[PDB]
Amino acid sequence: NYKKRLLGTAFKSSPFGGSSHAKGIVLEKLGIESKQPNSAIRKCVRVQLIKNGKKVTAFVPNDGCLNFVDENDEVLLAGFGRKGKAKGDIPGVRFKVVKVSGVSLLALWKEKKEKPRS
Amino acid sequence: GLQDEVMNIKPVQKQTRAGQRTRFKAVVVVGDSNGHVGLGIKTAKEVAGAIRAGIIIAKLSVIPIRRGYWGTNLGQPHSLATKTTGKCGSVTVRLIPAPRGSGIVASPAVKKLLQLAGVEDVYTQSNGKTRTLENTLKAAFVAIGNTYG
Amino acid sequence: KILTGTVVSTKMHRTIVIRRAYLHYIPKYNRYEKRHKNVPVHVSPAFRVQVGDIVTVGQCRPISKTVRFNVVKVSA
Amino acid sequence: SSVLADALNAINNAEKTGKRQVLIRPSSKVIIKFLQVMQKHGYIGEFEYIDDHRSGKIVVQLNGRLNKCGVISPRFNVKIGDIEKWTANLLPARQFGYVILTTSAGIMDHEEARRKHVSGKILGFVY
Amino acid sequence: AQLLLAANTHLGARNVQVHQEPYVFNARPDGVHVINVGKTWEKLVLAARIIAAIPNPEDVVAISSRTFGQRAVLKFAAHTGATPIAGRFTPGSFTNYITRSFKEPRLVIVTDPRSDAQAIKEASYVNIPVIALTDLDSPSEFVDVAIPCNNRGKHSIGLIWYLLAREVLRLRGALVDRTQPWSIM
Amino acid sequence: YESSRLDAELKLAGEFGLKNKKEIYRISFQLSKIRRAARDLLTRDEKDPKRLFEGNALIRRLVRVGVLSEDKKKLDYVLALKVEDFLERRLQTQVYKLGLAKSVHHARVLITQRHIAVGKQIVNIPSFMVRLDSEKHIDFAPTSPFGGARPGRVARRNAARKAEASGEAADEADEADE
RNA sequence: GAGCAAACCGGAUUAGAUACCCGGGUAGUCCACGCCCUAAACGAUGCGCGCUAGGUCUCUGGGUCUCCUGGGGGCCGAAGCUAA
RNA sequence: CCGCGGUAAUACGGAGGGCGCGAGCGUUACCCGGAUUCACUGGGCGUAAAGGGCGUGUAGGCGGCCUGGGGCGUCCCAUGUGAA
Secondary structure (H helix, E strand, O other), X not given: OOOOOOOOOOOOOOOOOOOOOEEEEEEEOOEEOOOXXXXXXXXXXXXXXXXXXXXXXXXXXXXXXXXXXXXOOEEEEOOOOOOOOEOOOEOOOOEEEOOOOOOOOOOOOXXXXXXXXX | OOEEEEEEEEOOOOEEOOEEOOOEEEEEEEEOOOOOEEEEEEEEOOXXXXXXXXXXXXXXXXXXXOOOOOOXXXXXXXXXXXXXXXXXXXXXXXXXXXXXXXXXXXXXXXXXXXXXXXXXXXXXEEEEOOOHHHHHHHHHHXXXXXXXX | OEEEEEEEEOOOOOEEEEXXXXXXXXXXXXXXXEEEEEEXXXXXXXXXXXXXXXXXXXXXXXXXXXXXXXXXXXXX | OOHHHHHHHHHHHHHHHXXXXXXXXXXXXXXXXXXXXHHHHOOOOEEEEEEEOOEEEEEEEOOOOOOOOOOOOOEEEOOOOOOOOEEOOOXXXXXXXXXXXXXXXXXXXXXXXXXXXXXXXXXXXXX | OOOOHHHHOOOOOOOOOHHHOOOEXXXXXXXXXXXXXXXXXXXXXXXXXXXXXXXXXOOEEEEOOOHHHHHHHHHHHHHOOOOEEOOOOOOOOOOOOXXXXXXXXXXXXXXXXXXXXXXXXXXXXXOOOEEEEEOOOOOOOOOOEEXXXXXXXXXXXXXXXXXXXHHHHHHHOOXXXXXXXXXXX | OOOOHHHHHHHHOOOXXXXXXXOOOOOOOOOOOOOOOOHHXXXXXXXXXXXXXXXXXXXXXXHHHHHHHHOOOEHHHHHHOOOOOOHHHEHHHHXXXXXXXXXXXXXXXXXXXXXXXXXXXXXXXXXXXOOOXXXXXXXXXXXXXXXXXXXXXXXXXXXXXXXXXXXXXXXXXXXXXX
């Protein structure tokens, strides 16, 4: 080109359609470990989104029981949070699964006393 | 009729043998609002001594910014006579006059000077290197000196 | 409208190719850019205009495809 | 580079040293025209034609003050050879100081240009 | 307070700075340049006049670190209420005046501005007028009020300074007698 | 809006007559004095209150500010419209200013309820912009708070005759008028 | 093709020594013709021009030659610049 | 964003208290912004990323002083257009 073109800004979440939410199907209910010093088993899930048709990894909030996510449960991805990513904890997870909504297969953690239920 | 506003006071710490010891610096602007302004920076172990020291220093070294002043010939009511662009080092500052109600639209370094300057309404722009210290401030100061009218 | 140019080519029948040159301010850049275009102009007598003449072309109804101009007259 | 830039630079450089006089530069009709405004605006004490080695030059009287940095603290070229800078009467620009423009009308200060209602390349700014 | 007769002491000094070209009368043998006293006089009138103004309430900080001058700067300085800097001009005396407290001086009487350049520079920033007995070696541009003459040589320094002091007192109404530093020679 | 108004007036700690009413901050330190805020705090806090006062949506509010911002002169008052520009210009506001209603909300309902007139034509649009030289009369069928209004003075920019229960917007009131 | 010396062949040292040390030694290092085209190819600083204190040593030319003036190489340093 | 939680956590959940200002509020997606990050406004290249190994020279970019013609750029005026 006349001048080299630099890479521009990229959107944080490509839920495609710039949509607020996208629904996908769980491929696998994996568990990833944190980075930096923190350690634990963060519960995550690969999801096949309809919109992008993209496959993504999403965080599953709440202590949950075991959690209510299985091999092929329908789920909604919020991108909850600005990015919806958990950078400090787990790289590669762009979105959060909304179970607060309790929409789809993701059930809400029951009887959660604390306010984060919201 | 010397208004006295204080730009700000900083703690300015220093380290010496096994020990930190701070002094205070106060920047004080003094002006008639009729065309005379002075800036003085004085330091002292205590904030008050510093401010008073600065005020006295500011009183010395006064400069005739051409804004409005006491009813006589008029400067520009809280605004500048004309647009000037000044480059100091990599820093370039641009000042453009504005009508009343515009406000002082500028980045902080430029703003802080223009306000004590007595300018109420201006449109500004910092371009090039924006080291506030390095030359944005110096650049602003030169820009002000340059103004005629 | 009316344009001025030179007859670059006599070769065709009843037609002449006039090369009009134009300068103008470009709307975006405002740079003064110059470009020229060739327009086929209708020459009925086929003796009217010879190569080398400077002529004024005028907007006309379509005579032929890719021809919308008639030789108004000879500038020279 | 640019003759005008050279002159502004020479004065800028000389003032820093605090030279009373300065061969601002070899004389040119345009350069002298510029200096005249510099004089009227009060930036320089004045200038004079001088002969150096049989070549015409313009001595520029520097004019400084007691308080601090030179009377002409700023002086920066704007239009430059790589990119010319032309401005409409609309955006002459304003500052506490003046800008010297060159118009078909002549070289005028920003205020003067406004009066004339003319535009032109913006040679430089001083204040 | 005058004396054109001064030709005995000051006159030219050998070395050079092209800028102080106007102040030089000509070159003598030994290649020493000679300062034209006629100009020296012109400058003194202008200079001294500035001086009469300042002594009503104003102070002048005299600065002479140079060795030839060092003793004299004290005497003439003591001779008036004025404060001097004899030994070594601490940096920031003017610029960071607050650290070394006093009131910022109205002016500075610097002997050898070239040597004393740090002091002169601080004045410029402060916009404090600068007077100086400066010769062929220094930049005239920097000095606000220049007394072109031998910057070196006690016979010279003593003369200008002592007189400048007398003028200070004379302006004061002191009616003080002749200067003691002459013995210093 | 139509949410608990009272708490907002407190906490903004600025007097807000969401009703005509009292200033003290609701919680933790109603008593303690809080004073001049920083520019930053000022900017955000200013937004919510300037808006909250009018009880108007951000969408409407934004347009008004943008216009006042472009025009020269201090944005704040020009924006403010004591009667000057925009904000107090709204018909709903004027009725409040006129004393027809005790509060701005009440005025809003009156205007919506149709108990208001402008130029005799009845207008129930609170967003209605009142221009200078318009009369804001109280609907014939209605008539009430005018009493008690009798002693109260009115902005120089406006005026009202208690008898007709009419009033006029004389001119755009300056912030000083505010 | 004298000397030197990757690889290599030996000696020693070492826990081991595919190394450093010692004895040998081929390519190569030299010449010609052609090819390769790299580098801490470094001032780690693209070229030209103008302007902005000086001091000191030095190479080369001119001068009225105990110093001035022109070109080049160093050191110290005004103003200024720099994150230092 | 930097990060917080491995038995004293102002960083997780609730509560009390506090600060700001819910007929909506918050999330997800997508576009512009911040991004002068495809630095013109408004950045840099001795040692931080960045001078090409050096030259010769093509295209191209740039061009000392004075006068006269032209008026292409440039500036001004009027007018037309710049729909809703």
